[PDB]
Amino acid sequence: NMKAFLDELKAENIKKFLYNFTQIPHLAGTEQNFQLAKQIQSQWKEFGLDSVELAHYDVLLSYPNKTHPNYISIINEDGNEIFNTSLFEPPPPGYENVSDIVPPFSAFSPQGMPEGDLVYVNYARTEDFFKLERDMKINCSGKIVIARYGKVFRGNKVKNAQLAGAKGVILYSDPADYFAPGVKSYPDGWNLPGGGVQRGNILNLNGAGDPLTPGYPANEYAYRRGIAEAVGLPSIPVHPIGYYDAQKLLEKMGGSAPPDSSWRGSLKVPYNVGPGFTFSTQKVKMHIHSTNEVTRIYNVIGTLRGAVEPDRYVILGGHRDSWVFGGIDPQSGAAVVHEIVRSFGTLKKEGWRPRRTILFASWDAEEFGLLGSTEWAEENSRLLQERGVAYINADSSIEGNYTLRVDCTPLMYSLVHNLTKELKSPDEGFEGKSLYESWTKKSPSPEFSGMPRISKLGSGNDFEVFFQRLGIASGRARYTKNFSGYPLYHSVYETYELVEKFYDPMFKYHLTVAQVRGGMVFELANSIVLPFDCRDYAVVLRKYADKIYSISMKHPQEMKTYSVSFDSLFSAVKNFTEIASKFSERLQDFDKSNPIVLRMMNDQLMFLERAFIDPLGLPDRPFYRHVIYAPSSHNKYAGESFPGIYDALFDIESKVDPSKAWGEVKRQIYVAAFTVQAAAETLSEVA
Amino acid sequence: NMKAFLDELKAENIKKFLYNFTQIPHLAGTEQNFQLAKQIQSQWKEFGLDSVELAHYDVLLSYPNKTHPNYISIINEDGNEIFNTSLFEPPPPGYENVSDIVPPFSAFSPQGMPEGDLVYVNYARTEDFFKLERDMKINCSGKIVIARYGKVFRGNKVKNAQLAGAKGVILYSDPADYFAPGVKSYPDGWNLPGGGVQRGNILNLNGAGDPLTPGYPANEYAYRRGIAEAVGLPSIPVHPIGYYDAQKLLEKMGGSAPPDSSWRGSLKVPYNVGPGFTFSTQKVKMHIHSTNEVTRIYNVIGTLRGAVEPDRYVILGGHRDSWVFGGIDPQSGAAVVHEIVRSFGTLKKEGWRPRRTILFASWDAEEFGLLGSTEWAEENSRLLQERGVAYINADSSIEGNYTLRVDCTPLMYSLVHNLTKELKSPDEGFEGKSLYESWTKKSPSPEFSGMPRISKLGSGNDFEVFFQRLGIASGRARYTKNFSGYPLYHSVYETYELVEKFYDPMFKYHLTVAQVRGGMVFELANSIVLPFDCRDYAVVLRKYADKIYSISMKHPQEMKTYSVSFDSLFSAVKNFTEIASKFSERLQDFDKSNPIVLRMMNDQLMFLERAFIDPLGLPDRPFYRHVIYAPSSHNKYAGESFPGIYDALFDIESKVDPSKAWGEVKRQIYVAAFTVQAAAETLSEVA
Ligand SMILES: *[C@@H]1O[C@H](CO)[C@@H](O[C@@H]2O[C@H](CO)[C@@H](O[C@@H]3O[C@H](CO)[C@@H](O)[C@H](O[C@H]4O[C@H](CO)[C@@H](O)[C@H](O)[C@@H]4O)[C@@H]3O)[C@H](O)[C@H]2NC(C)=O)[C@H](O)[C@H]1NC(C)=O
Ligand SMILES: *[C@@H]1O[C@H](CO)[C@@H](O[C@@H]2O[C@H](CO)[C@@H](O[C@@H]3O[C@H](CO)[C@@H](O)[C@H](O[C@H]4O[C@H](CO)[C@@H](O)[C@H](O)[C@@H]4O)[C@@H]3O)[C@H](O)[C@H]2NC(C)=O)[C@H](O)[C@H]1NC(C)=O
Ligand SMILES: *[C@@H]1O[C@H](CO)[C@@H](O[C@@H]2O[C@H](CO)[C@@H](O)[C@H](O)[C@H]2NC(C)=O)[C@H](O)[C@H]1NC(C)=O
Ligand SMILES: *[C@@H]1O[C@H](CO)[C@@H](O[C@@H]2O[C@H](CO)[C@@H](O)[C@H](O)[C@H]2NC(C)=O)[C@H](O)[C@H]1NC(C)=O
Ligand SMILES: *[C@@H]1O[C@H](CO)[C@@H](O[C@@H]2O[C@H](CO)[C@@H](O)[C@H](O)[C@H]2NC(C)=O)[C@H](O)[C@H]1NC(C)=O
Ligand SMILES: *[C@@H]1O[C@H](CO)[C@@H](O[C@@H]2O[C@H](CO)[C@@H](O)[C@H](O)[C@H]2NC(C)=O)[C@H](O)[C@H]1NC(C)=O
Ligand SMILES: *[C@@H]1O[C@H](CO)[C@@H](O[C@@H]2O[C@H](CO)[C@@H](O)[C@H](O)[C@H]2NC(C)=O)[C@H](O)[C@H]1NC(C)=O
Ligand SMILES: *[C@@H]1O[C@H](CO)[C@@H](O[C@@H]2O[C@H](CO)[C@@H](O)[C@H](O)[C@H]2NC(C)=O)[C@H](O)[C@H]1NC(C)=O
Ligand SMILES: *[C@@H]1O[C@H](CO)[C@@H](O)[C@H](O)[C@H]1NC(C)=O
Ligand SMILES: *[C@@H]1O[C@H](CO)[C@@H](O)[C@H](O)[C@H]1NC(C)=O
Ligand SMILES: *[C@@H]1O[C@H](CO)[C@@H](O)[C@H](O)[C@H]1NC(C)=O
Ligand SMILES: *[C@@H]1O[C@H](CO)[C@@H](O)[C@H](O)[C@H]1NC(C)=O
Ligand SMILES: *[C@@H]1O[C@H](CO)[C@@H](O)[C@H](O)[C@H]1NC(C)=O
Ligand SMILES: *[C@@H]1O[C@H](CO)[C@@H](O)[C@H](O)[C@H]1NC(C)=O
Ligand code: MET
Ligand code: MET
Ligand SMILES: [Ca+2]
Ligand SMILES: [Ca+2]
Ligand SMILES: [Cl-]
Ligand SMILES: [Cl-]
Ligand SMILES: [Zn+2]
Ligand SMILES: [Zn+2]
Ligand SMILES: [Zn+2]
Ligand SMILES: [Zn+2]
User: Fold this and answer.
1) Set of chain B residues whose Cβ sits within 8 Å of the Cβ of A682
2) Which of A58, B352, B397, B603 has the most CB atoms around it within 10 Å of its CB?
3) Residue ranges of region NAALADase (chains A, B)?
4) Which residues, in sequence order, are bridge partners of residue B630?
């Protein structure tokens, strides 16, 4: 049973595995990450799984040129380079050995050496550009943009800059966002030093996976697009820097003053918007020589065969590739997965099997655009869509030590509330209290009443293909602090020591998280009726419908003129509530001795998330197919509800042809209404 | 059991129902067809079904203007109309009563009155236009095209004419194609009189359904495209005529002689290609005033709930709407469906239920582009794709009286061979012999060896959405003669008397067909393991792969230059064969006492057709999603195998950018190979 499973999980095994996984860098596509793959594969076998395989793919990756390093320069009239930015981050104490740490770069930047004047765009959010262009009437065309990291996915920033006519992008971490007051810089604290730099890809894939093979696995015989038809590549060069190098670049900024104080970081500089310097005269020059190449990646797939329903899959998955040492990201998740596998393997060895099949994945190349999970899901989509019960993600276990953070489909709200009521809180001052209780006090639902906050699923991690493309119920859970990161995210300072010393000295937060993740998986794979409560969907659908309705009501005149009615959507949401209620009654009232009836009802529960998928996808985003959730078009990290209606409404006042625009709003209402009604009807009696 | 079911079917009930259904016209959208819907609905209830509902939709239909009739004219220099074509067909004896028979028209023609010179284009097939433009260097731009009916779907003809720059199309039936030697014209024989005219729609929908709501049911709150963005509407006017009116128009043809004798019909005319008349001087003028309007349609859906697996659907479906009386098309099918329902209802009343759910449909508006079946499938696609076991079509039972004609998925080859070995042949001179035996002697497989021909499924009937869009295993069966029609197809002369006197005086062919259709449905809904043999798919996949390979090999030089390899496809087809064999062994070797294992294996058998669906669809045809079969792009009535590779190869010598063209061939090989491999893997052990 479950306590057995949970009792078997040890804090000290997790620490042990974390140490093992973080001694050398495990960059996607490198030999070291292949070797770590083989090791996971051997150990998952010893741990007892029925089978363990590697699945490989040849996918587009991106690397700096070793012999021609990227950097930024200030140049004078004579094109002399007065100031150059760092070529690497100062490595942390004890790691001068590090054979090779990849230098900071933006993965997938095109090559180039543009020069021009700087304009400062705050976070380079859509509203930031609105403010700049609309109110301040500044123009970025032909400019080099400098933006700080934070708020939104960096690929969104680069896309907004391209849209604004920019010719290059410089990204940096501002201490306002990455330096927590009263804490010391690494190695004496968990703060980001001025030499530290955030790596990460800057693609706008919208779910496509490998840029060359959208729709299909990048296997041996795959036909590949030419790089010119590749999906999601930026067309301007981009490069990231620390705040020391950034202060040099910002200290001379001329033109307009920040429009207000929210545009201002913590550096001792004016934060002028520019364009140009105060040093007329001087310009900025980028040197990007990174290359894209087709490189092989390896996922590790382990299988624990179910005893009763082997053709039903519960999936625990998390990535193994890291920018450098991956102390937090991803090895604090991977080490938790490893102990969960060891622990399932133990039960199995004593003769136990779960009811359903459990699949365990160690994904590759997440950092480069969720490529390993996606290609694998493109290859197995027929199995996943007919047999996939649920997907639990397992990136970083901790990103703070304050409370539980859970994002999932409403189908799993009750499972997560129940499970956490049986778990001991590991928080100071809640000893003897349940996880549900510390979590509820520290993180109260706005939505009401005496319940914890649970968020929507956006994207930016490996659950994306499972939920947004395939409609498989998905969740994730981690410890967090009281979309920007923790200060040391994706830098060289993310090490084993960072975690042992400052985050989780006892590894008790890792353990709590291993219980939540492992317990969810255990319940999903073994409970006789699937632990999904469809009435939870009925509740949030109503809230989401009120929400998009209020957004539309900011335009009463247009609603009148174009006859924009939400009646069909509320009507669909009403029918969903009613039918969902009745389906629950039947769920309570039928006999579990009849297997066929049990399988039927489970199939209904399983396909219910699947019912929300539109095979045509959302407009311009063919691989985002879920009609209720999609990643925000302004922020890949954030979920948006009724994404098709929301985007039809967004900035509608600016559209040239109002009735065409409002026509499209109404089309999206219709699509949403029909999909909600069709989903509800899957829960009707079947004949 | 099955004999019980079959013994219950009577020839005389079928005749009785056929008579009842053919006394007045039942045009889609008219009150008479609503009334016939209500009657079917009452009678399916009395017959015993658990429930019977009407599902309605508001869809684009098309009608002639009653007070401004369509016709064609010959005009002189002074624009005088010398010759006008008929305004209606002479009604058959006894039907001068007929309140109103719609006059011949091409459904969905735009309005217009173009004048110009005639060019004669034979069947207006793609090769016909190749011959005309390429070899004869004739130019149709600005011309009015005249084509004879036959060979290919009429909508393809109109699209080829548009592509060729034509400004109007005149369609007619040539006695070469619609007058069988030695037989008399109706009412004294089954031949087409010179006054008879073939109705039918001329859309190019490619699976979209209702032109205004592609993707989604045309329900009450549906958002509808503007007619200018409608799917599949021709942009030139089109009108059909009999061979009397056609002889007048053809007798004066000038320009070139027919390129050869295959261009020549049976009329006593030269069959000159034109352009223009021999009467310089005279021109042709079209008068089309037909309108398109959104009109309500009604499907009747009956349900016979399964005893053991109510959430598994076997579907028997056929249309009810007719151009006029529908003596053959569709009421000879509808009357067979009615007797099958009555017969299932009888068993049910004596306490029996099938194992799986059976759904019975009477579709509306088939004649106007398969609209009723399609809209219903767009509305229920989530149920159909997870629960749909099989779809059996039921249009016309007879179109000849020579032998059985069966088209179906390879998954049903064995079911159809077995079932027909248990059925008595109704053919003269095979009394005491089995249906399999007359059918095999009269219609031998080319493919080998001692087996009957079974054809590929294309489109042009209501199975289209189920098979080509949704991937549900589909079949159809009918009596045929020794893509053009029978002579009286879609004319006013298609009556009850036509069938009683000349086709099936005893109704014994209707009865055989009711046994084949009802027996297939019975086996599918009741057999414990689904009666599909996946090794039949392995066999035809190999044949199809040889076939497309030979087509490519006509271009050895390009295959060399571009490195076009079919190795991945043959490799996929090999793995399919191997895995299919092993899956059959397990299928034989497992115990039917374990229900869960039985359901698992049945689910594999059920989803196997589903595995061949690509959610991106085929290029430019988003609603054709099956990778192995699609309707021919040159002939909606015909199936093409590996449609994506075939179309990439078709007329490739003519493409401007060879490596781009050959690139696309290779892409399609890759897609085909991967889909075959993914389908095979669904039949692997599941964990
Ligand atoms: C939520 O579930 C309910 C059912 O429980 C479902 O209600 C349905 O609403 C539709 C659309 O309003 C109803 O449609 C009617 O059908 C009857 C025949 O049964 C027709 O006579 C009506 O048509 C006339 O009136 C229309 C509206 O003014 C005219 O436009 C039309 O031209 C006709 O003159 C009408 O179409 C349907 O009957 C009910 N079904 C019921 C009550 O069982 C509702 O649609 C669901 N919500 C969603 C979004 O699906
Ligand atoms: C039909 O089923 C068979 C399996 O039963 C399946 O065979 C697979 O073929 C692939 C592709 O050829 C094999 O891929 C190899 O994998 C190994 C590692 O296991 C690699 O070392 C190999 O890569 C090297 O060689 C390549 C080819 O020259 C180089 O391009 C590459 O850069 C490497 O140097 C190679 O990728 C795979 O191992 C087998 N699997 C087996 C035999 O189990 C076949 O693909 C199926 N058919 C289809 C169309 O799917
Ligand atoms: C991580 O732990 C693994 C497994 O214990 C270590 O790999 C084993 O170590 C020795 C080499 O000294 C070999 O005898 C085994 O073959 C290895 N087992 C494998 C690959 O599964 C590995 O050395 C550890 N890594 C670190 C950095 O300590
Ligand atoms: C920034 O780096 C550049 C590139 O290395 C330095 O300029 C180079 O310096 C060498 C030695 O003076 C010259 O031979 C090259 O011509 C220069 N290269 C280019 C492309 O300008 C420059 O010194 C650095 N700037 C500072 C302030 O250190
Ligand atoms: C979470 O736990 C609650 C409370 O135990 C469960 O709700 C009960 O479930 C049982 C078993 O079917 C019913 O008999 C009770 O009537 C339910 N009580 C309530 C308050 O609804 C709920 O099912 C659990 N959710 C899960 C386990 O997914
Ligand atoms: C087709 O058969 C039906 C059913 O027997 C006939 O409809 C019935 O006829 C009488 C009207 O004379 C009524 O008492 C019943 O209400 C009808 N039943 C229905 C509608 O289910 C119908 O008249 C026949 N049609 C023809 C042309 O003979
Ligand atoms: C073909 O039909 C046209 C249309 O009815 C006939 O021409 C019309 O005839 C009436 C009476 O002569 C005239 O008043 C109209 O002006 C004509 N209409 C048009 C549009 O031309 C014509 O007679 C018919 N041709 C033949 C040979 O019967
Ligand atoms: C068609 O009938 C053939 C011959 O009876 C069936 O094949 C046999 O099926 C039985 C039952 O599983 C096996 O034990 C035999 O070994 C099979 N014989 C052969 C020749 O294969 C076949 O299964 C039937 N196809 C159907 C009913 O779908
Ligand atoms: C890296 O830089 C060298 C020159 O310094 C260049 O010639 C080489 O091609 C580069 N490597 C690439 C582009 O992969
Ligand atoms: C922005 O400035 C550039 C300067 O070259 C100009 O080409 C472009 O049209 C301007 N656009 C706006 C938003 O005014
Ligand atoms: C963990 O422990 C305490 C709890 O308040 C906190 O003050 C400290 O900052 C935490 N460590 C990190 C890395 O947040
Ligand atoms: C039919 O023709 C009349 C005139 O004869 C026209 O005015 C009317 O609008 C037409 N009906 C239509 C177009 O539906
Ligand atoms: C066909 O003839 C028309 C005459 O107007 C001309 O415009 C068109 O370019 C010609 N095309 C070909 C195929 O020569
Ligand atoms: C039906 O019966 C005989 C069989 O040869 C045939 O000659 C006759 O033409 C058939 N009727 C039709 C309509 O084909
Ligand atoms: C490429 S989607 C997100 C990848 C990675 N988790 C990042 O946030 O940088
Ligand atoms: C619109 S697809 C075919 C419709 C009808 N069966 C015809 O052949 O005319
Ligand atoms: Ca791919
Ligand atoms: Ca539609
Ligand atoms: Cl996570
Ligand atoms: Cl048919
Ligand atoms: Zn990560
Ligand atoms: Zn990361
Ligand atoms: Zn028909
Ligand atoms: Zn027809």
Assistant:
1) 382-383, 386
2) B397
3) 218-524
4) B640
Could you say which of A50, A223, A308 has the minimum Cβ distance to residue B667? A223
CATH homologous superfamily, domain B532-687: Transferrin receptor-like, dimerisation domain (1.20.930.40)
Q: Is the CB of B35 under 6 A from ligand 6?
A: no
Ligand 18 centroid–CA B170 distance in Å is 30
Q: B667 is written with which tokens?
A: 């892409």
List residues near ligand 11 (CB under 6 A): A 190, 400-401, 481, 502-503
Among candidate residues B404, B394, B407, the one with its CA nearest the CA of residue B330: B394
Please tell me the distance from the alpha carbon of residue A316 to that of residue B171, in angstroms, as a whole number: 62
* B221 chain-A contacts, CB cut-off 8 A: 567-568, 670, 673
* Sign, CA torsion B6/B7/B13/B14: positive
∠ CA B673-B674-B676, nearest 5°, is 65
Stated in angstroms to one decimal place, the resolution of this structure is 2.4
Question: Is B532-687 the same fold as B65-288?
Answer: no
The SS3 assignment for B459 reads coil
Contact at 8 Å (CB) between A603 and B311?
yes
Q: Under a CB-based contact definition with an 8 Å cutoff, are residues A386 and B686 in contact?
A: no
- Amino acid identity, position A416: V
DSSP symbols for B398-438 = BS-SSEEEEEE-GGGHHHHHHHHHTSB--STT-TTSBHHHH
CA distance B342 to B323: 26
Cβ(B70)–Cβ(B287) below 8 Å: yes
Partnered with residue A112 across adjacent β-strands are A288
Grouping H, G, I as helix, E, B as strand and the rest as coil, residue B83 is: strand
- What token pair was written down for B642? 């590996």
Distance (Å, rounded) from C-alpha A235 to C-alpha B344? Answer: 65
Take residue A676 and report the two structure tokens written for it.
């909600």
Look-up of token digits 């009925």: A538
Helix pair A508-526, A11-21: axis angle to 10 deg: 100
In whole angstroms, give the CA distance from residue B572 to residue B670.
10
CATH architecture assigned to B65-288:
3-Layer(bba) Sandwich (3.50)
B265-295 burial string, b = 16+ CB within 10 Å, else e?
bebebbbbbbbbbeeeebbbbbbbbbebebb
- B391: Cα within 13 Å, side-chain hemisphere: 28
Domain boundaries along the sequence of chain A = 1-64+289-531, 65-288, 532-687
Sorted by sequence, the CB contacts under 8 Å of residue B602 that are 6+ apart come out as: B312, B529, B530
Query: Could you give the 3-state DSSP secondary structure of residue A478?
Result: strand
Residue closest by Cα to atom 4 of ligand 7 = B81
Q: How many Å apart are CA B337 and CA B561, to the nearest integer?
A: 56
DSSP structure class, residue B472: -
DSSP state of A147: E
In whole angstroms, how far apart are CA A321 and each of A43, A45, A104, A475, A685?
Answer: 18, 21, 16, 21, 46
Q: Please name the amino acid found at residue B367.
A: E
Architecture of domain A1-64+289-531 in CATH? 3-Layer(aba) Sandwich (3.40)
| Helices marked H in B611-682 | 643-649, 658-681
How much of chain A is helix, strand and coil, in % rounded to 5?
Answer: 40, 20, 45
Return the sign of the alpha-carbon dihedral for residues A198, A202, A207, A209: negative
